[PDB]
């Protein structure tokens, strides 16, 4: 199968949120995935910042490929760093998946109570993300 990992990064490099869909097993190793990739999102970011200074493309499909960890970047106008990291490729899912992530993010970013670079606990957003994952990633 494919592994599933989403991350949300504030402008101030704050990891706002992270979402998972992989078949549940060895939860300690899934947390290892989390920090592995959250700290991979570190050089990925130190890289993708100049990459975004190069191209203002819709979405930076590939930033690094660790030969088992894959870096896909959809950076926002507010520079919100977004990365999907997976052991397997699925480009068509990920492109418009980051699209729909961005969309529901706009929806839940409008609310005045949110302030820049802040974790968002809205389980409505959780189920919106889950529906997207079942649409564009999971089967």
């Amino acid at each position: 199968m494919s592994t599933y990992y989403f991350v949300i990064v504030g402008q101030n490099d704050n990891p706002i949120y992270e979402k998972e869909f992989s078949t549940v097993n060895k939860e300690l190793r899934k947390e290892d995935h989390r920090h592995l990739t959250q700290f991979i999102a570190h050089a990925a970011l130190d890289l993708v910042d100049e990459h975004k200074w190069k191209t203002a493309n819709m979405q930076l499909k590939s930033i690094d490929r660790f030969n088992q960890w894959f870096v896909s970047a959809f950076i926002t106008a507010s520079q919100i760093r977004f990365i999907i990291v997976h052991d397997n490729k699925n480009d068509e899912g990920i492109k418009n998946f980051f699209n729909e992530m961005y969309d529901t993010y706009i929806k839940n970013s409008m609310n005045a109570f949110y302030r820049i670079n802040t974790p968002i606990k809205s389980p409505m957003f959780e189920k919106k993300s889950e529906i997207f994952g079942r649409k564009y990633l999971l089967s």
Binding site: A56, N57, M58, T76, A77, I106, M110, Y114, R115, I116
Partner: protein, 164 residues
């Protein structure tokens, strides 16, 4: 209405003028409100009205974000743009229309600065969220005018990518 927004904004200014003691911190509070506006409008208009595609380069983003923000705020782009050689950090964005005068303005004795700073606050929000930390001053020179002090790392960064 026009006048409902003018009224709600008069209550803005008055709430500040209440729980704020002196003018410059009142302008600071206006600037905070402006940051609040920008913080979400910029992400909105990345897609719908900005060709859905990101733009990074300085002057293009300056002018185009100027225009798109003004179209979806008042539908009136800023009348001119000056970027000053004598200080490459010093750019001026100037709009003859003050957002303030929806209600025509304040006493002309106590507060030299006005909503002009609150609009400057929205400006600062969008710039710094695009990737352009900057400080903005509102001056009553040639009507409502502004001046932007970009970020040093940013100023070096684009000064370097002046070429490809």
């Amino acid at each position: 209405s026009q006048s409902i927004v003018a009224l709600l904004f008069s209550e803005i200014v008055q709430y500040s003028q209440s729980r704020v003691f002196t003018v410059p911190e009142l302008q600071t509070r206006l600037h905070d409100l402006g940051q609040d506006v920008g913080t979400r409008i910029i992400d909105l208009y990345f897609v719908r009205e900005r060709s859905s595609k990101r733009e990074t380069k300085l002057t293009q983003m300056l002018l185009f974000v100027k225009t798109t923000v003004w179209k979806n705020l008042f539908g009136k782009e800023a009348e001119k743009l000056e970027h000053a050689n004598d200080d490459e950090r010093t750019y001026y964005i100037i709009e003859k229309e003050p957002l303030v005068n929806t209600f025509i303005s304040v006493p002309k004795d106590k507060g030299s600065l006005n909503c002009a700073n609150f609009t400057a606050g929205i400006v600062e929000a969008v710039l710094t969220n695009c990737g352009f930390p900057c400080k903005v001053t509102a001056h009553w020179h040639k009507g409502t005018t502004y001046m932007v002090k970009f970020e040093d790392f940013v100023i070096a960064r684009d000064k370097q990518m002046e070429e490809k």
